Every structure is written in structure tokens, then in C-alpha cells.
Amino acid sequence: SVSKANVPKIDVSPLFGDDQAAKMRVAQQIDAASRDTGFFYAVNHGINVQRLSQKTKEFHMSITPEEKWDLAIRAYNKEHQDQVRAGYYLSIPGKKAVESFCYLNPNFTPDHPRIQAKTPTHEVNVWPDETKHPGFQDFAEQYYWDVFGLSSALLKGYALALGKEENFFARHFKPDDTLASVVLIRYPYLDPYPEAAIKTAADGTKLSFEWHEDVSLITVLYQSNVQNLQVETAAGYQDIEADDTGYLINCGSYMAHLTNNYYKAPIERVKWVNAERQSLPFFVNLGYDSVIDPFDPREPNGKSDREPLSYGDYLQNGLVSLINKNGQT
Numbered sequence: 651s652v653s654k655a656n657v658p659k660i661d662v663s664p665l666f667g668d669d670q671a672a673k674m675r676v677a678q679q680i681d682a683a684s685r686d687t688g689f690f691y692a693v694n695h696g697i698n699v700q701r702l703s704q705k706t707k708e709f710h711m712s713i714t715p716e717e718k719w720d721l722a723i724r725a726y727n728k729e730h731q732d733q734v735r736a737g738y739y740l741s742i743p744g745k746k747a748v749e750s751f752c753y754l755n756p757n758f759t760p761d762h763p764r765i766q767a768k769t770p771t772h773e774v775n776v777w778p779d780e781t782k783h784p785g786f787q788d789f790a791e792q793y794y795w796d797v798f799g800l801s802s803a804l805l806k807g808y809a810l811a812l813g814k815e816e817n818f819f820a821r822h823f824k825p826d827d828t829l830a831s832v833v834l835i836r837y838p839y840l841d842p843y844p845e846a847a848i849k850t851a852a853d854g855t856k857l858s859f860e861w862h863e864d865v866s867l868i869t870v871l872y873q874s875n876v877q878n879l880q881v882e883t884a885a886g887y888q889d890i891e892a893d894d895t896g897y898l899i900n901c902g903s904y905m906a907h908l909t910n911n912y913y914k915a916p917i918e919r920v921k922w923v924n925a926e927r928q929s930l931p932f933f934v935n936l937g938y939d940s941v942i943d944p945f946d947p948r949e950p951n952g953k954s955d956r957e958p959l960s961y962g963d964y965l966q967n968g969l970v971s972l973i974n975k976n977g978q979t
């Protein structure tokens with residue numbers, strides 16, 4: 651028997667406006683959700699999601715094996731030593747069903763000082779031939795800034811919810827240095843479906859991706875209308891309903907650190923479903939040198955003894971660790 655998690659739908663539109671009292675009522679809902687299962691759906695968000703799934707499937711189903719190799723990250727192509735994060739993540743027929751494409755801050759170019767310095771976690775995006783995928787790059791870059799704007803407002807909600815000024819988080823979230831990433835994931839329908847691609851959980855549940863905490867400040871996710879996600883509660887794993895018009899939001903391990911675990915990073919996993927579906931996370935990461943001073947909203951004095959963490963090194967350790975634990979994606 652598997653229960654369903656309480657994931658409220660929060661109208662976040664006041665976070666874009668100037669009704670400060672209305673914003674506090676949104677922050678309260680974010681507070682409650684972060685203290686419950688950790689998840690909530692952001693609705694009335696103003697982003698056009700109507701074609702996100704189609705474009706994601708179109709791009710994945712129309713890209714050729716030759717193109718995949720030419721864009722593949724280092725894990726799949728030894729000739730691309732600089733592509734650790736951005737590029738194509740090939741499937742492995744018979745062994746690995748998922749495939750995806752990851753891109754970073756469009757402002758990361760050869761002129762960027764972090765690219766010039768070869769700083770870890772910074773890379774220049776690789777893109778397919780414009781003529782083979784017309785309008786794909788323009789769409790991708792515009793979506794990055796569309797979800798950036800949504801994420802900036804959500805961070806204002808989290809800051810107010812924690813008793814801080816609305817810019818407590820967003821001030822470190824900037825277009826000229828953010829390490830945030832978009833991933834365009836395709837989960838294919840396969841018949842037969844290779845068992846080597848399915849993992850069996852301790853509780854017997856068949857999975858495509860095992861338990862983990864997110865490496866982010868917050869995660870802003872859109873998915874097609876196929877239920878798959880689960881959150882661990884003390885009463886066991888609980889199904890997270892799908893909502894192909896809203897954005898599923900949750901806190902990452904960086905938030906759990908700086909809040910002294912007041913807003914825990916929920917443990918989540920992906921159930922195996924034999925169906926064609928798309929998953930498009932936006933990982934809200936700060937700058938490489940961004941540092942937020944921890945605090946404890948549970949203490950009268952609000953003091954925390956935790957060490958302030960540079961976000962860049964945190965992201966570098968988090969991503970490698972996640973690959974080491976749940977495998978290369």
C-alpha cells in the first residue's frame with residue numbers, strides 16, 4: 651500500500667507584484683509546504699508550458715546518432731573533456747532508457763572570466779545545427795530566462811517565509827554568474843522494456859532512478875502528465891501527483907544546510923513507468939563564489955553554528971557524489 655503526498659497548489663502570482671501583504675500569505679503557504687512533505691505546485695506562474703513537452707520529444711526523437719556523439723558530454727565521448735555538465739546524455743539500448751540534454755547559463759562564453767580561468771562547473775553550451783533543429787536554440791535560451799524569472803520570484807517567497815527580507819536569496823541569483831542548469835529529459839516507451847534499466851527498491855518498488863536529495867538551492871520542475879515521482883516521509887514513500895500545467899517546487903540540500911535543517915531537502919525517487927514522457931528540471935544554483943550565512947529559524951536568537959558554504963564547491967561535490975551514488979545519467 652502506497653499513500654499520496656499532500657502537495658498543495660500555491661498561487662505564486664503575488665510574488666511578481668507589489669502587494670506585500672499578499673506576498674506574506676504566499677510565503678506562509680510555502681512555509682507550511684516546506685515543513686510538510688517539502689513539495690508544492692506553483693500555479694498561475696505565467697510561463698507558457700503548452701509546447702515544452704512536444705519540443706522536448708521532437709528534439710530527442712529527431713536528433714540522429716551522429717549528432718548525439720557530436721554533442722555528447724565527457725562521460726560518453728572522450729574527445730569532449732570540457733563537457734562535464736552541458737551536452738547530450740545518450741541512452742544505452744537494452745541497458746539505459748533515459749536520454750537528455752543539459753545546458754547552462756547562456757552568458758557563459760569564451761569572454762566570461764570564469765571560462766577564461768577554467769573554473770570548475772563553468773562551460774560553454776554546445777548546440778545542434780540550427781538547420782537540423784530550427785528554432786531549438788532560441789527556444790531553449792528563452793526558456794532558461796523565463797524560468798529564471800519565475801525562480802527569482804519563488805526565492806522571494808522562501809526568504810519572506812524564513813523571516814528575512816525578500817531579497818535574502820535572490821540577491822545571489824544573477825544572470826551574469828548563475829550556475830543554474832536546464833535538463834531536457836526524455837523517458838521513452840519501450841516494448842519490451844529492458845530489465846537492466848529498472849532498479850528494484852528496498853520496498854520492492856520498481857524504479858528508474860533511486861532515492862536522493864537534490865543538489866540545488868531549490869528545484870523548479872515541469873513534467874508531462876504521467877505520475878512517476880515519490881517523496882519519502884516517516885510513514886514511507888508517497889506518490890506525488892502529476893500536474894502538467896504547474897511547476898513542482900522543492901528545496902535542495904543547500905537550503906537544508908543554511909536553514910539548519912528547518913527546510914529539509916526531501917528524499918525523492920522516480921518510479922518506473924512504461925510510457926513516453928518528458929521531465930524538464932531547472933536547478934536553481936547561485937554563483938560560484940556565492941555564500942549565504944546559515945541561521946536557525948527554530949532558535950530564539952536565530953543563531954547557527956554551521957559553516958557558510960561557497961556554492962560552487964558545494965555544487966561540484968554534489969554532482970560528482972550524485973553520479974557516484976545513483977550512476978551516470
Ligand SMILES: CC(C)[C@@H](NC(=O)[C@H](CS)NC(=O)CCC[C@H](N)C(=O)O)C(=O)O
Nearest residue numbers: 735752831833835859864920929931972979
Ligand atoms: C526527478 C527529476 C528532477 C529528474 N532527475 C534529475 O534531473 C536528476 C535528479 S535531481 N538530476 C541529476 O542527476 C543531476 C543533473 C545535473 C546537471 N547535469 C547539471 O550539470 O546541472 C528525472 O526526471 O529523472
Ligand SMILES: [Cl-]
Nearest residue numbers: 943953954955
Ligand atoms: Cl553568527
